[PDB]
């Protein structure tokens, strides 16, 4: 077909945010939970809703054009196919601002953990054998792999393994099974990827247009509009504290020769630490306003 | 009573946004789902929560002062009462910015649709007989009406009708019953209406005050505060692309470009953002507005 | 088509129990909430899932064969069509054992001739009208299709005539139930025009199943010990579907064992009355299916 | 350890019924959704709550004693391991009375299907490549496999395949994606299985005891206690209509009829009830049985 | 008033079963979550739905007639009022068949527990200070009380106490907070209680009637109707396995065996069914009983 | 050591208590079953407890900070005082949530003219101490009936003649045929601290958090305003709009009679103020939200 094909997760932790991103990029569509393919009404785009496990392979095989997938799953599949002698490839278009999670080694609460060497020779249960293997090789630790495709935290209490390597964000399931997180081995986030084989000129131009929108949407979520007063003597430090998307606008203050007004757009979000550092450097009247849309 | 009476939908697609609008207009009230009448604590206003079907009639009969109702239901009921020889009347105060939907003719997926004439002589099932009738009369198409008050999309597969005229927004229920949308006949949105008979001077003044607030609230939702850089050579085009509530503020930059600050009349879609970039605009920032009054 | 068409409520208070009844009558089907027609896999039957409001009309117009509908909605619509000069008709096959509710006049907590001249708000104008005409009371009708209990506090009416089962919504709006005017339950109805012989025979078969399913829910299998001297009184306390089976008890000459199937369910009052008459070892077992 | 280990699905279509069966077999335990091992309080049994996909492998590897799994998943995994040169083995203890589903070939609604040969050379998408392969080999049909681990019904509309081989029970998801079921290739239900390597004498005796309970629970669900009146003349015919677990008890009632008490081997359907009446039976009572043991 | 007043829990672990019991005793009423007092339509009875904490006090003060409350809350409050010099009193009418739980001492998983003496001098956190105190006194153990009205399992990790005394049924919350149950100090269930001061003759007669119904309802839940075949030679052993006198019936054309019909006093567990089979019993049927009265 | 903050586990204050801490830059992972959350970026432990216990934990010095409703705080303070104890604490900040009131209510049918109508009545409440203090202050004798919940049942069930109950909406009162008649106490959530001095390091952390709390609350209330004002009306317009700082006044290019005013309001802008500004000749009034602010 002439229409651009984008694979996203049908249901799971990435689904809502994947749809939201596309929608905020002006891709109008009607999604019914039972329908596995949504057709955009205003753009030549088909959204395929599939299991996240299959997204890397669909992209590697060139059967969809774009995909939104967690880095962890993308790499685990890439490594697996490489280990079977294949040469999977893809283009990473953008690391996205959701799907944050980590892959961590965990042990029974009772165990005494001092360092990574404590895993030497242990049986380790995981749904991510390749990612675990690569990390253990890099650190020169021998172990016995036990692959489980789910319910990984059962393994120690059930004597299937001595430890686990599992995905975590909150920590809940670990506590419930008498386990403690001990070492983060991998950090992941959602990515937007593209198949390796060149698209048609028209499809590629549509991807280019979307990508500009994606960057815009993400940048608007992170960036803030900042207004503050700064002493002229401290301007360079203040700017170093708050990196901007462009050069700051500097305006004279009418009744005041020692200070200036600074208007700028931050590259990153403003945390209280930064607000406090700015005040320490002599900044005052600091205002941070939200931005709904932007385009550099 | 001396208190102003406003009828809104108890529960349904208009309920949340009807309450939100009143709340954003400074009408403080405590609503609980089981209570059918909420009394405003800061203004002399009673909110009656009723079935949307009855709102037009309550207004026509002059028994409430204001109502928020979908256009589709308002006119269907107006037309129905006219067909019984009555003379319903009301004042349309404002078309609102929610309750968007459409009434559409639909056919079985298998049917070949070329033009409206393909509906000649067909049996058409609908919950909106009057709206359908008026549209078919305007376009000179004869048909057989089949009134169903719900589950309209069953009619073709159940051989109650050859086609349907139904409310749609998403399209889901049509696919599930092997139907395709083929012609939009009516587009609807929520409206704020008032009874025909004059109110007391005090009540009318309260309505006037609320109306100004309604316009403000709606404008603040649509309008955005825009900041961008524009080449001086392209300002006229840039301003045409983005109509404003007032004239833009133009500020010199620390050369051949200027800074433009303005308030858009409408919301900024990506197409506009892209058209501005094409015309040479850069550093385009769009900030939300919480309240406004010209 | 050759297939029998049954209209039931898509979603609402009658839906679950309508499907259950058909299912317990051996009508196998797969219902998906979004699908508005279910086809029976084991019988030539189509289930049309519609709004309850339309079921009477579909039956009156002969466009479906059977329907399950609340009596209240059935007669309200019958009366409405009669008032427009039409002559709706149907066959009442069976009053069912669910959908119980009542239509009641209610007044503000603070307050039949007392309704004389009052404004009365209702979603059932025809049923109210018929009742008020029968009792010779003049009133002013106010039709509301929902939220009826708002009317008094909102000064739309002086009283209401509304559907109730629990009473909750009345208390919440400072109203009290004052007079029941109509009692309703779900009914199974059929169109007036004769069916084909094959369709009618299928309906006849279903009807016997419906009766069986309902009787099994009400009837219980009863075993007890009774003194021979009190046997007549005990049998009078417990009407049965058949004559009781009477069995001698080993080594007890004054008493007998009684096994029977009750026509109605056994309430504690009956259990206590049986004990008063000298019955002992009373056992009540549930029945899953029956056919007399 | 001395305790018997049983693997069941953590969450999914088999979970509720797996727990119910064990509970009805007198295995007391407290399951918290977050806890992946439940310890029986009254028997030496550990319930491991896992992903269904892993249950066959845990059994093949002898690392749990019992498992409750769908036949489809069991044989798909058995076949997969055989294709890698392994020799997986297990004992099938009992086919259970839930988890009913089927694996079926399906095509777009528009396609003309006459025979299995119409699948010749087609791309077929499935989560059950091995089961599909075995069936296609048995019937001598060449095809191209496309493995998808979920959302299989997307494949045709997305041009990933020409057809699918997917699990169905209702049919809903097929309609929603413009597909029609065309050929059932495999029928499945939940099974209770055991590892191949011999258990201790104590563990095996516990399994034996549980198995008799499983059979009892399943028979009690199917069997009913029946009481009816039959004419003495029609007696032979009535018994033939109603196969029992034992011979019927016949009791005198007046002189022309008898009372019949019996336990049915199978459940009583309305057809049987109606056949009995036709043969002259009356006062037919069917009572539920909560527990039984032959 | 002339009407009998019964206090039950509005919402919580006892609420559903309290209502069910009354309903199964033929008390017809319409109970809506928003309504705090339900009036029985068929009997002169008012159901007050309150917080369980207050039920003992309402009974002690003679302000309601009956109450359904957990033993633990009843005695905790009794003890508390006694410690303030009051003399609370009540009549225990019946221990009921729901609301089962236990009050248990628990420690961090890491702690070595050998005996009760290990609690000597510890800080113990509990919502049931009086029940804990009575138990620690009866055993001569000194400790430091820490009263928390909820979230008791936080205390050790938060260094508010060294141990806890908390309500448990399913040990979930203990595991989640790295705690282990180590000594049950008190076992509880729901009870039906009555105020001490004599009721009117009419009210007391109504209570008497309800009590017989309560006993009947509970017995019907436990008792089962049993039918089996037994060898005449094993009849005594079989009857000893199954605690009124059984009905013994001859089997037609079988002289070595008899049919036994019994109503069990207790429920039949698999152990008993297996023991019956071991003694030569066969065709064992257990049917449910809906109502009974001796 | 680590700073200990007690908040409500689940209830009306729980969400907003967590949100406030989160908006103050306290990062933490809270799982509903977990009763103690450890901040990942600051030395802070969040204890999730029953609100009833928070005052006592603070009084006893066993946690450092607490977020609790005023009503529960003073009810417990009063209760402990009545047992001869001397509970004490520091009130750090009245917060912008947990708004409710304690009110006397009567059956709808009763005729209420004055507080004296409560003389000698039986009054049911979960807040005996707060009621007692109010009734003593106003010299009214009554009979207390303590109920720990379902207070609105008491009149219809003849447990009392009246109630003193927490309300925000009036829903539950209507449902039980009661009317609110006199507000006796107004409450909101408070952030409190134990009386005994903290270590210098812990106190400095509290000081830092407090400035953040004030910032977060100010950003919720304050708005960024832009408008046009006639030069002749500037003084009146500024009086209508108290600001956090002095307004910035800018000339308008094509217009000599008017100026542009940019400012940050101290309070939120209600329609009344917008309308008053317009009445005074202001035009093009824009109100933008503020996400964070520091003076
Ligand atoms: N707490 C979390 N927050 C954000 N993202 C997460 C979190 N946990 C996991 N993820 C990411 O989301 C991805 C999908 O998670 P999810 O649990 O929905 O996948 P799944 O269980 O494999 O679902 P399916 O296979 O049915 O698509 C993970 O691979 C990971 O990249
Ligand atoms: N998808 C939609 N989005 C927004 N508004 C809609 C949509 N569909 C319909 N509406 C509007 O909302 C009105 C009410 O629809 P809704 O389904 O809430 O009430 P209803 O079906 O009439 O139910 P009831 O009569 O019981 O309140 C419609 O008449 C129409 O004006
Ligand atoms: N407590 C009750 N209140 C109202 N109706 C009841 C009640 N109990 C049973 N019914 C029966 O159920 C029928 C349908 O009630 P329900 O509220 O489901 O339908 P509805 O309000 O007409 O909605 P719809 O128009 O969507 O089918 C009533 O006409 C009545 O016969
Ligand atoms: N309609 C159905 N669709 C799919 N499986 C069904 C159906 N009915 C019964 N089953 C059975 O249930 C088993 C488990 O299905 P389920 O969808 O719960 O697991 P899953 O999708 O593999 O999820 P998980 O991997 O989390 O255990 C299937 O292998 C099958 O044997
Ligand atoms: N696992 C359990 N945990 C606590 N109480 C239980 C448990 N099982 C049964 N109960 C009984 O339920 C009673 C209280 O139940 P529940 O926890 O619902 O009320 P509550 O928490 O005291 O709430 P309220 O005080 O608001 O009524 C206990 O006093 C006890 O008798
Ligand atoms: N409408 C309201 N009703 C009652 N309390 C409110 C209300 N609004 C705010 N609150 C505040 O929230 C506090 C706790 O409310 P909530 O009812 O959640 O706790 P609770 O019922 O005492 O539960 P727990 O004791 O189990 O924490 C009150 O003490 C009060 O300060
Ligand atoms: Mg996955
Ligand atoms: Mg409507
Ligand atoms: Mg209806
Ligand atoms: Mg699976
Ligand atoms: Mg309690
Ligand atoms: Mg509390």
Short mmCIF file of N, CA, C and O and ligand atoms in Angstrom, two decimals, chain C residues 9 51-53, ligand 9:
data_model
loop_
_atom_site.label_atom_id
_atom_site.label_comp_id
_atom_site.label_asym_id
_atom_site.label_seq_id
_atom_site.Cartn_x
_atom_site.Cartn_y
_atom_site.Cartn_z
N UNK C 9 -34.25 -6.87 25.92
CA UNK C 9 -33.53 -5.65 26.22
C UNK C 9 -32.00 -5.82 26.03
O UNK C 9 -31.40 -6.74 26.59
N UNK C 51 -33.69 -1.63 22.50
CA UNK C 51 -34.12 -0.83 23.64
C UNK C 51 -35.50 -1.31 24.08
O UNK C 51 -36.36 -1.57 23.24
N UNK C 52 -35.71 -1.39 25.39
CA UNK C 52 -36.94 -1.99 25.91
C UNK C 52 -38.17 -1.22 25.40
O UNK C 52 -39.18 -1.83 25.07
N UNK C 53 -38.03 0.10 25.28
CA UNK C 53 -39.09 0.97 24.78
C UNK C 53 -39.69 0.52 23.46
O UNK C 53 -40.85 0.79 23.20
MG1 LIG G 9 -36.28 2.38 28.16
#
